[PDB]
Design an enzyme around this catalytic site. Structure first.
Site, PDB file in Angstrom:
ATOM      1  N   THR A   1      52.379  44.072  48.326  1.00  0.00           N
ATOM      2  CA  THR A   1      53.278  45.100  48.802  1.00  0.00           C
ATOM      3  C   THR A   1      52.596  46.228  49.578  1.00  0.00           C
TER       4      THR A   1
ATOM      5  N   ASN B   1      46.705  45.804  46.168  1.00  0.00           N
ATOM      6  CA  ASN B   1      47.429  46.707  45.290  1.00  0.00           C
ATOM      7  C   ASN B   1      46.462  47.377  44.298  1.00  0.00           C
TER       8      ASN B   1
ATOM      9  N   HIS C   1      59.845  38.242  40.514  1.00  0.00           N
ATOM     10  CA  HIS C   1      58.745  38.020  39.567  1.00  0.00           C
ATOM     11  C   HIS C   1      59.221  37.399  38.235  1.00  0.00           C
TER      12      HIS C   1
ATOM     13  N   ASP D   1      58.389  42.895  53.253  1.00  0.00           N
ATOM     14  CA  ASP D   1      56.932  42.977  53.238  1.00  0.00           C
ATOM     15  C   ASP D   1      56.226  41.616  53.018  1.00  0.00           C
TER      16      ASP D   1
ATOM     17  N   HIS E   1      53.351  36.490  44.545  1.00  0.00           N
ATOM     18  CA  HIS E   1      52.994  36.412  45.951  1.00  0.00           C
ATOM     19  C   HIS E   1      51.614  37.022  46.083  1.00  0.00           C
TER      20      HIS E   1
ATOM     21  N   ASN F   1      28.444  40.608  62.071  1.00  0.00           N
ATOM     22  CA  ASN F   1      28.845  41.758  61.230  1.00  0.00           C
ATOM     23  C   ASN F   1      30.335  41.666  60.800  1.00  0.00           C
TER      24      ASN F   1
ATOM     25  N   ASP G   1      33.267  41.831  61.948  1.00  0.00           N
ATOM     26  CA  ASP G   1      34.261  42.867  62.283  1.00  0.00           C
ATOM     27  C   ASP G   1      35.370  42.346  63.213  1.00  0.00           C
TER      28      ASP G   1
HETATM   29  C1  LIG Z   1      42.154  46.783  64.843  1.00  0.00           C
HETATM   30  O1  LIG Z   1      42.497  48.076  65.421  1.00  0.00           O
HETATM   31  C2  LIG Z   1      41.574  49.125  65.038  1.00  0.00           C
HETATM   32  C3  LIG Z   1      41.993  50.473  65.640  1.00  0.00           C
HETATM   33  O2  LIG Z   1      41.925  50.321  67.056  1.00  0.00           O
HETATM   34  C4  LIG Z   1      40.136  48.739  65.424  1.00  0.00           C
HETATM   35  O3  LIG Z   1      39.339  49.595  64.604  1.00  0.00           O
HETATM   36  C5  LIG Z   1      38.597  50.554  65.353  1.00  0.00           C
HETATM   37  O4  LIG Z   1      37.423  49.895  65.819  1.00  0.00           O
HETATM   38  C6  LIG Z   1      36.383  50.667  66.475  1.00  0.00           C
HETATM   39  C7  LIG Z   1      35.071  49.825  66.597  1.00  0.00           C
HETATM   40  O5  LIG Z   1      34.755  49.063  65.375  1.00  0.00           O
HETATM   41  C8  LIG Z   1      36.119  51.974  65.680  1.00  0.00           C
HETATM   42  O6  LIG Z   1      35.382  52.867  66.537  1.00  0.00           O
HETATM   43  C9  LIG Z   1      34.369  53.631  65.794  1.00  0.00           C
HETATM   44  O7  LIG Z   1      34.834  54.966  65.520  1.00  0.00           O
HETATM   45  C10 LIG Z   1      33.907  55.785  64.790  1.00  0.00           C
HETATM   46  C11 LIG Z   1      34.655  57.055  64.350  1.00  0.00           C
HETATM   47  O8  LIG Z   1      35.553  56.597  63.329  1.00  0.00           O
HETATM   48  C12 LIG Z   1      36.329  57.592  62.615  1.00  0.00           C
HETATM   49  O9  LIG Z   1      37.362  58.183  63.417  1.00  0.00           O
HETATM   50  C13 LIG Z   1      38.461  57.309  63.744  1.00  0.00           C
HETATM   51  C14 LIG Z   1      39.431  58.024  64.684  1.00  0.00           C
HETATM   52  O10 LIG Z   1      40.140  59.071  63.998  1.00  0.00           O
HETATM   53  C15 LIG Z   1      39.149  56.811  62.460  1.00  0.00           C
HETATM   54  O11 LIG Z   1      40.267  55.964  62.773  1.00  0.00           O
HETATM   55  C16 LIG Z   1      38.141  56.041  61.596  1.00  0.00           C
HETATM   56  O12 LIG Z   1      38.792  55.519  60.397  1.00  0.00           O
HETATM   57  C17 LIG Z   1      38.010  54.495  59.701  1.00  0.00           C
HETATM   58  O13 LIG Z   1      37.100  55.006  58.707  1.00  0.00           O
HETATM   59  C18 LIG Z   1      37.726  55.691  57.601  1.00  0.00           C
HETATM   60  C19 LIG Z   1      36.637  55.934  56.568  1.00  0.00           C
HETATM   61  O14 LIG Z   1      36.017  57.164  56.927  1.00  0.00           O
HETATM   62  C20 LIG Z   1      38.912  54.958  56.941  1.00  0.00           C
HETATM   63  O15 LIG Z   1      39.757  55.894  56.234  1.00  0.00           O
HETATM   64  C21 LIG Z   1      39.779  54.160  57.917  1.00  0.00           C
HETATM   65  O16 LIG Z   1      40.530  53.218  57.110  1.00  0.00           O
HETATM   66  C22 LIG Z   1      38.910  53.464  58.988  1.00  0.00           C
HETATM   67  O17 LIG Z   1      38.088  52.445  58.341  1.00  0.00           O
HETATM   68  C23 LIG Z   1      37.891  51.223  59.115  1.00  0.00           C
HETATM   69  O18 LIG Z   1      37.028  51.404  60.268  1.00  0.00           O
HETATM   70  C24 LIG Z   1      35.629  51.696  59.991  1.00  0.00           C
HETATM   71  C25 LIG Z   1      34.860  51.822  61.325  1.00  0.00           C
HETATM   72  O19 LIG Z   1      35.196  53.050  62.010  1.00  0.00           O
HETATM   73  C26 LIG Z   1      35.006  50.627  59.068  1.00  0.00           C
HETATM   74  O20 LIG Z   1      33.681  51.010  58.661  1.00  0.00           O
HETATM   75  C27 LIG Z   1      35.892  50.356  57.836  1.00  0.00           C
HETATM   76  O21 LIG Z   1      35.445  49.191  57.141  1.00  0.00           O
HETATM   77  C28 LIG Z   1      37.354  50.097  58.202  1.00  0.00           C
HETATM   78  O22 LIG Z   1      37.452  48.785  58.804  1.00  0.00           O
HETATM   79  C29 LIG Z   1      36.904  56.936  61.330  1.00  0.00           C
HETATM   80  O23 LIG Z   1      37.225  57.940  60.354  1.00  0.00           O
HETATM   81  C30 LIG Z   1      32.651  55.978  65.655  1.00  0.00           C
HETATM   82  O24 LIG Z   1      31.724  56.849  65.008  1.00  0.00           O
HETATM   83  C31 LIG Z   1      31.987  54.618  65.954  1.00  0.00           C
HETATM   84  O25 LIG Z   1      30.861  54.813  66.861  1.00  0.00           O
HETATM   85  C32 LIG Z   1      29.618  54.078  66.609  1.00  0.00           C
HETATM   86  O26 LIG Z   1      29.483  52.836  67.347  1.00  0.00           O
HETATM   87  C33 LIG Z   1      29.382  53.035  68.781  1.00  0.00           C
HETATM   88  C34 LIG Z   1      29.528  51.740  69.580  1.00  0.00           C
HETATM   89  O27 LIG Z   1      30.009  52.069  70.895  1.00  0.00           O
HETATM   90  C35 LIG Z   1      28.063  53.728  69.122  1.00  0.00           C
HETATM   91  O28 LIG Z   1      27.922  53.930  70.536  1.00  0.00           O
HETATM   92  C36 LIG Z   1      28.011  55.078  68.418  1.00  0.00           C
HETATM   93  O29 LIG Z   1      26.660  55.533  68.554  1.00  0.00           O
HETATM   94  C37 LIG Z   1      28.412  54.997  66.931  1.00  0.00           C
HETATM   95  O30 LIG Z   1      27.252  54.512  66.228  1.00  0.00           O
HETATM   96  C38 LIG Z   1      26.640  55.469  65.334  1.00  0.00           C
HETATM   97  O31 LIG Z   1      27.001  55.195  63.973  1.00  0.00           O
HETATM   98  C39 LIG Z   1      26.586  53.902  63.488  1.00  0.00           C
HETATM   99  C40 LIG Z   1      27.134  53.662  62.068  1.00  0.00           C
HETATM  100  O32 LIG Z   1      26.892  54.776  61.188  1.00  0.00           O
HETATM  101  C41 LIG Z   1      25.057  53.793  63.583  1.00  0.00           C
HETATM  102  O33 LIG Z   1      24.635  52.473  63.232  1.00  0.00           O
HETATM  103  C42 LIG Z   1      24.544  54.095  65.000  1.00  0.00           C
HETATM  104  O34 LIG Z   1      23.097  54.008  65.039  1.00  0.00           O
HETATM  105  C43 LIG Z   1      25.118  55.437  65.519  1.00  0.00           C
HETATM  106  O35 LIG Z   1      24.585  56.611  64.875  1.00  0.00           O
HETATM  107  C44 LIG Z   1      33.033  53.649  66.555  1.00  0.00           C
HETATM  108  O36 LIG Z   1      33.331  54.001  67.911  1.00  0.00           O
HETATM  109  C45 LIG Z   1      37.384  52.693  65.145  1.00  0.00           C
HETATM  110  O37 LIG Z   1      37.089  53.760  64.218  1.00  0.00           O
HETATM  111  C46 LIG Z   1      38.268  51.713  64.397  1.00  0.00           C
HETATM  112  N1  LIG Z   1      39.462  52.384  63.913  1.00  0.00           N
HETATM  113  C47 LIG Z   1      40.097  52.126  62.754  1.00  0.00           C
HETATM  114  C48 LIG Z   1      41.349  52.947  62.487  1.00  0.00           C
HETATM  115  O38 LIG Z   1      39.788  51.251  61.922  1.00  0.00           O
HETATM  116  C49 LIG Z   1      39.749  47.323  65.016  1.00  0.00           C
HETATM  117  O39 LIG Z   1      38.502  46.963  65.641  1.00  0.00           O
HETATM  118  C50 LIG Z   1      40.841  46.317  65.417  1.00  0.00           C
HETATM  119  N2  LIG Z   1      40.511  45.018  64.901  1.00  0.00           N
HETATM  120  C51 LIG Z   1      40.400  43.915  65.692  1.00  0.00           C
HETATM  121  C52 LIG Z   1      40.010  42.634  65.013  1.00  0.00           C
HETATM  122  O40 LIG Z   1      40.592  43.953  66.908  1.00  0.00           O
HETATM  123  O1  LIG Z   2      58.219  54.157  48.354  1.00  0.00           O
HETATM  124  C1  LIG Z   2      57.508  53.299  47.827  1.00  0.00           C
HETATM  125  C2  LIG Z   2      57.336  53.199  46.321  1.00  0.00           C
HETATM  126  C3  LIG Z   2      56.353  54.223  45.883  1.00  0.00           C
HETATM  127  C4  LIG Z   2      56.826  55.280  45.089  1.00  0.00           C
HETATM  128  C5  LIG Z   2      55.978  56.306  44.713  1.00  0.00           C
HETATM  129  C6  LIG Z   2      54.645  56.297  45.112  1.00  0.00           C
HETATM  130 CL1  LIG Z   2      53.603  57.566  44.585  1.00  0.00          CL
HETATM  131  C7  LIG Z   2      54.156  55.276  45.914  1.00  0.00           C
HETATM  132 CL2  LIG Z   2      52.548  55.420  46.585  1.00  0.00          CL
HETATM  133  C8  LIG Z   2      55.003  54.211  46.282  1.00  0.00           C
HETATM  134  N1  LIG Z   2      56.794  52.399  48.633  1.00  0.00           N
HETATM  135  C9  LIG Z   2      56.176  51.114  48.206  1.00  0.00           C
HETATM  136  C10 LIG Z   2      54.678  51.083  48.679  1.00  0.00           C
HETATM  137  C11 LIG Z   2      54.481  51.660  50.048  1.00  0.00           C
HETATM  138  N2  LIG Z   2      53.281  51.453  50.563  1.00  0.00           N
HETATM  139  C12 LIG Z   2      53.081  51.907  51.807  1.00  0.00           C
HETATM  140  N3  LIG Z   2      53.958  52.557  52.582  1.00  0.00           N
HETATM  141  C13 LIG Z   2      55.170  52.756  52.030  1.00  0.00           C
HETATM  142  C14 LIG Z   2      56.137  53.465  52.941  1.00  0.00           C
HETATM  143  C15 LIG Z   2      56.906  52.489  53.807  1.00  0.00           C
HETATM  144  C16 LIG Z   2      58.257  52.268  53.660  1.00  0.00           C
HETATM  145  C17 LIG Z   2      58.883  51.381  54.535  1.00  0.00           C
HETATM  146  C18 LIG Z   2      58.166  50.755  55.519  1.00  0.00           C
HETATM  147  F1  LIG Z   2      58.820  49.854  56.320  1.00  0.00           F
HETATM  148  C19 LIG Z   2      56.790  50.963  55.696  1.00  0.00           C
HETATM  149  C20 LIG Z   2      56.192  51.825  54.825  1.00  0.00           C
HETATM  150  C21 LIG Z   2      55.472  52.323  50.733  1.00  0.00           C
HETATM  151  C22 LIG Z   2      56.809  52.577  50.101  1.00  0.00           C
HETATM  152 CA   LIG Z   3      56.199  43.800  47.867  1.00  0.00          CA
HETATM  153 CA   LIG Z   4      30.998  41.592  65.576  1.00  0.00          CA
HETATM  154 ZN   LIG Z   5      55.798  41.712  43.814  1.00  0.00          ZN
END
Ligand SMILES: *[C@@H]1O[C@H](CO)[C@@H](O[C@@H]2O[C@H](CO)[C@@H](O[C@@H]3O[C@H](CO[C@H]4O[C@H](CO)[C@@H](O)[C@H](O[C@H]5O[C@H](CO)[C@@H](O)[C@H](O)[C@@H]5O[C@H]5O[C@H](CO)[C@@H](O)[C@H](O)[C@@H]5O)[C@@H]4O)[C@@H](O)[C@H](O[C@H]4O[C@H](CO)[C@@H](O)[C@H](O)[C@@H]4O[C@H]4O[C@H](CO)[C@@H](O)[C@H](O)[C@@H]4O)[C@@H]3O)[C@H](O)[C@H]2NC(C)=O)[C@H](O)[C@H]1NC(C)=O
Ligand SMILES: O=C(Cc1ccc(Cl)c(Cl)c1)N1CCc2ncnc(Cc3ccc(F)cc3)c2C1
Ligand SMILES: [Ca+2]
Ligand SMILES: [Ca+2]
Ligand SMILES: [Zn+2]
Ligand code: NA
Ligand code: NA
EC number: 3.1.4.39
Length: 807
Positions: free
Chosen positions: A159, A180, A265, A308, A422, A687, A689
């Site tokens: 979910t 979950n 379920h 979902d 599921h 890596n 990714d």
């Molecule tokens: C699906 O779609 C998504 C979205 O388009 C694609 O993901 C993007 O991919 C990009 C490349 O992999 C990536 O770009 C990087 O951004 C870095 C900054 O990131 C932060 O800010 C963004 C923007 O607000 C934010 O979205 C990010 O959020 C991630 O991380 C937080 C945790 O803090 C999580 O809450 C969140 O869920 C998300 O996690 C996911 O992404 C990260 C990677 O960012 C993973 O580690 C997780 O597992 C998870 O999958 C961030 O908060 C930026 O700093 C990077 O730059 C480095 O690389 C470039 C290469 O050009 C280099 O030039 C730079 O120097 C830099 O390297 C330096 O750091 C390195 C590591 O420490 C180091 O080795 C070097 O030596 C350097 O010092 C990079 O540009 C982008 O963030 C994500 N976005 C998201 C939302 O995931 C995805 O690829 C698509 N998938 C497919 C299959 O197509």
């Molecule tokens: O409301 C709920 C039950 C719920 C209640 C209290 C708390 Cl404290 C939490 Cl955490 C969940 N849920 C189920 C899990 C969930 N997970 C991610 N996004 C959503 C929002 C949402 C709704 C519709 C849509 F099309 C896409 C996303 C949702 C919506």
């Molecule tokens: Ca569900």
């Molecule tokens: Ca790769």
């Molecule tokens: Zn279920």
């Protein structure tokens, strides 16, 4: 701490969330135990139920009532949803004939049609047909609007990952809600369905639709609902928000139902007890639509009815126990159920070894109902690896089964409760869910092909005039759902142009350690072979243009009689090889005299070529060919297939797979599809990714050399959707199937691999089915650049996944 002695008077289901310690009145206050003292009295009124009756019509307003039947209720926005029907002689929405909504018919002051997402938990795709007799409001949405026969969820089909994917357009690996239940080793914190850690914003990555909207000046209703708010109250709240003044009124809303998942379920997907929850959901849809009709919004709002994930038959007796395979079962932590994730119980235990756990779980029992994987070896289509919250060891569980650590886990959590679950592989039929779009912006009475839920974020942004945040949808691939607001993308610009080398090297400049018995010699045919090397057959083998290289690199286009390739000077092998095989093509053998033949390519320097001596000295690695010698058009053309520029590194175990594909399956497909065009190549994703590796990310080379070892091999197999036309003379839409095969030094993944390839190779390839878009990400190439077809149509084609599930 909450100072719950504040009041909810005039704040009931307020949209802005107030800060602690101040008490709350929003739709999540119950979940946080933070509601003001008078929340139930004021905001959860139930008196007299949810429906007007004849005796209440025109009543004097009593503010204790759950909803109102008094003359003033319409102007207050708080009538019972059946008010106009009971008291004003109007029809239910469901009883009205469908009439096309060609343009929004909206009240004054509406800037845009609102969007209402109606999300149903556990709503399996086949409920649309199987339950159609007891869901008349849903059936009217489906038949009058735009629907898909099903919508594919993301993996795992749970979910929270799927609802958050709907909201973000992101794979779970990217948004961070990878199950979950989760453990984040950087935070050293656990996320659970029960309890308080799941409220912390650090779990929830990407940018969900409600934030995207708010950032761009569009107001959003809150998408979450505490479980104890009854469905009728959720609907009345939405309808009340829709009556707000223009400056305060949200443009996007979501309703969430815990049904039919909750009952599924307990009873199984088709338990007789499932009829009632399907009826009740339909009634709720009816309330919404009758309510919209009362507000004159039923031809103004876009409504999405979406699930979902689905629901499968699963019972306690179909559980595999890791205690039956592992000696050391107390040294591991298992996230159990319909998928498995394993890690070390203690990071201080240095005797923990994932290699030994994987081996102890591999093909041990003849009917074994799960398969272990290092996460990087999971099918790429799952996009389930690139997050530190995903454990290195994964178990893919067969549909209908569970995995658990020990039997005591299943009967001390000894009889069985549940009949449905599921979470399985997202290509499994029982996990598919639903999509219906109804409204001015959706098409009328239109069926669309199945698509993935990652695509909807873009469309929801289009429906609201928002620019989507960066996501994993392919924007434009769902334009065929929409009457208007289509997004018209441009093709990405090619970054690297190819070189077109002619003959520049003499044979004796090469010292590659290769040999070929090819010293076998005419002006008719001499000009003719020259023409082939300059591209005279390229129209036949390169049907959709050459792929565009979307990154900076050095590569050459090489033409041949039977195939064309884009040869990388950096990776010393083709990025892609393209060839067309007609229905009539014949398969031949590799002749005896050419068994070990590798020939220098005089268009490509020794320095940018592979060498045979590397392969001789690497006892682990052999080689194969991208264009298969078996499909040469003639004995003389066959020599081209043994060029060193057509060679790629292959483990002998993988060569078994690859040779069967090339010798048997390609021709089979050409016979079944009336010719195919094939594009094959290597992928490097060390890596894990999902994105093309740069040169400096390659972890493995052929021993002693600079020849990088692919992690995977792809193929894209395209033909005419109208199979009465041959692939190379197709006038209309295309048909594609593709795969991304892991390049592994053993066939441990295939438990029947000691048998003939006809019993296991094709099963392997189906498991590793892929979208063309998946290959694009992994290679930095852009395919189908030169067709007769609209770009949106091509985007749809690129997102197609051939699933190999029956109806
Ligand atoms: C699906 O779609 C998504 C979205 O388009 C694609 O993901 C993007 O991919 C990009 C490349 O992999 C990536 O770009 C990087 O951004 C870095 C900054 O990131 C932060 O800010 C963004 C923007 O607000 C934010 O979205 C990010 O959020 C991630 O991380 C937080 C945790 O803090 C999580 O809450 C969140 O869920 C998300 O996690 C996911 O992404 C990260 C990677 O960012 C993973 O580690 C997780 O597992 C998870 O999958 C961030 O908060 C930026 O700093 C990077 O730059 C480095 O690389 C470039 C290469 O050009 C280099 O030039 C730079 O120097 C830099 O390297 C330096 O750091 C390195 C590591 O420490 C180091 O080795 C070097 O030596 C350097 O010092 C990079 O540009 C982008 O963030 C994500 N976005 C998201 C939302 O995931 C995805 O690829 C698509 N998938 C497919 C299959 O197509
Ligand atoms: O409301 C709920 C039950 C719920 C209640 C209290 C708390 Cl404290 C939490 Cl955490 C969940 N849920 C189920 C899990 C969930 N997970 C991610 N996004 C959503 C929002 C949402 C709704 C519709 C849509 F099309 C896409 C996303 C949702 C919506
Ligand atoms: Ca569900
Ligand atoms: Ca790769
Ligand atoms: Zn279920
Ligand atoms: Na070798
Ligand atoms: Na095997």
């Amino acid at each position: 701490w909450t100072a719950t002695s504040g009041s909810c008077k005039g704040r009931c289901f307020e949209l802005q969330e107030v800060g602690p310690p101040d008490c709350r009145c929003d739709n999540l206050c119950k979940s946080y135990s933070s509601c003001c003292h008078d929340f139930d009295e004021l905001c959860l009124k139930t008196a007299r139920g949810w429906e007007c009756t004849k005796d209440r019509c025109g009543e004097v307003r009593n503010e204790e009532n759950a909803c109102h039947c008094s003359e003033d209720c319409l102007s207050r926005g708080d009538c019972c949803t059946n008010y106009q029907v009971v008291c004003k002689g109007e029809s239910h929405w469901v009883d009205d004939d469908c009439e096309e909504i060609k343009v929004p018919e909206c009240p004054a002051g509406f800037v845009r049609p609102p969007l209402i997402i109606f999300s149903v938990d556990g709503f399996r795709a086949s409920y649309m047909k199987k339950g159609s007799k007891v869901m008349p409001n849903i059936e009217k949405l489906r038949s009058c609007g735009t629907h898909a026969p099903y919508m594919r969820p993301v993996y795992p089909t749970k979910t929270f990952p799927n609802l958050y994917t709907l909201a973000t357009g992101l794979y779970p690996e990217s948004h961070g809600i990878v199950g979950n239940s989760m453990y984040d080793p950087v935070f050293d914190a656990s996320f659970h369905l029960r309890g308080r850690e799941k409220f912390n914003h650090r779990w929830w990555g990407g940018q969900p639709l409600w934030i995207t909207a708010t950032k761009q000046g569009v107001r959003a209703g809150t998408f979450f609902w505490s479980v104890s708010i009854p469905h009728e109250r959720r609907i009345l709240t939405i309808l009340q928000w829709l009556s707000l003044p223009d400056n305060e009124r949200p443009s996007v809303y979501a309703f969430y139902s815990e049904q039919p998942d909750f009952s599924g379920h307990k009873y199984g997907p088709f338990g007789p007890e499932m009829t009632n929850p399907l009826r009740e959901i339909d009634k709720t849809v009816g309330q919404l639509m009758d309510g919209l009709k009362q507000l004159r919004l039923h031809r103004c709002v876009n409504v999405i009815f979406v699930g979902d994930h689905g629901m499968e038959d699963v019972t306690c007796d179909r559980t595999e126990f890791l205690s039956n395979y592992l000696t050391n079962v107390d040294d591991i932590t298992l996230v159990p159920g319909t998928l498995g994730r394993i890690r070390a119980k203690s990071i201080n235990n240095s005797k923990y070894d994932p290699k030994t756990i994987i081996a102890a779980l591999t093909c041990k029992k003849p009917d074994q109902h799960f398969k272990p994987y290092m996460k990087q070896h999971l099918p790429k289509r799952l996009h389930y690896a690139n997050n530190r919250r995903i454990e290195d060891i994964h178990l893919l569980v067969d549909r209908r089964w569970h995995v658990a650590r020990k039997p005591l886990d299943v009967y001390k959590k000894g009889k069985c409760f549940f009949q449905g679950d599921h979470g399985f592989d997202n290509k499994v039929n029982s996990m598919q869910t639903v999509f219906v779009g109804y409204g001015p912006t959706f098409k009328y009475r239109t069926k669309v092909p199945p698509f993935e839920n990652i695509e909807l974020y873009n469309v929801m942004c289009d429906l609201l005039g928002l620019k989507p945040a960066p996501n994993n949808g392919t924007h434009g691939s769902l334009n065929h759902l929409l009457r208007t607001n289509t997004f018209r993308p441009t093709m990405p610009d090619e970054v690297s142009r190819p070189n077109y080398p002619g003959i520049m090297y003499l044979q004796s400049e090469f010292d590659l350690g290769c040999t070929c018995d090819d010293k076998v010699e005419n002006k008719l045919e001499e000009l003719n072979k020259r023409l082939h090397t300059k591209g005279s057959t390229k129209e036949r083998h390169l049907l959709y243009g050459r792929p565009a290289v979307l990154y900076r690199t050095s590569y050459d286009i090489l033409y041949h009689t039977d195939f064309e390739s884009g040869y990388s000077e950096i990776f010393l092998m083709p990025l892609w090889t393209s060839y067309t095989i007609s229905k009539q093509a014949e398969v031949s053998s590799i002749p005896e005299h050419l068994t070990n033949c590798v020939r220098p390519d005089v268009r490509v320097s020794p320095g940018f070529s592979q060498n045979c001596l590397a392969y001789k000295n690497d006892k682990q690695m052999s080689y194969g060919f991208l264009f298969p010698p078996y499909l040469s058009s003639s004995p003389e053309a066959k020599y081209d297939a043994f060029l060193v520029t057509n060679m790629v590194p292959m483990y002998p175990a993988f060569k078994r797979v690859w040779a069967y594909f090339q010798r048997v399956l390609v021709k089979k497909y050409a016979s079944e599809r009336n010719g195919v065009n094939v594009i094959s190549g290597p992928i490097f994703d060390y890596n894990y990714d999902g994105l093309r590796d740069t040169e400096d990310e390659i972890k493995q080379y052929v021993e002693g050399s600079s020849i990088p070892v692919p992690t995977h091999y792809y193929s894209i197999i395209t033909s005419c959707l109208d199979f009465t036309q041959p692939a190379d003379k197709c006038d209309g839409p295309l048909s594609v199937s593709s795969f991304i095969l892991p390049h592994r030094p053993d066939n441990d993944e295939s438990c029947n691999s000691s048998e003939d390839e006809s019993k296991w190779v094709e099963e392997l390839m189906k498991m590793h089915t892929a979208r063309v878009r998946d290959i694009e990400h992994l290679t930095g190439l852009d395919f189908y650049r030169k067709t007769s077809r609209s770009y949106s149509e091509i985007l749809t084609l690129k997102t197609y996944l051939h699933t190999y599930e029956s109806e």
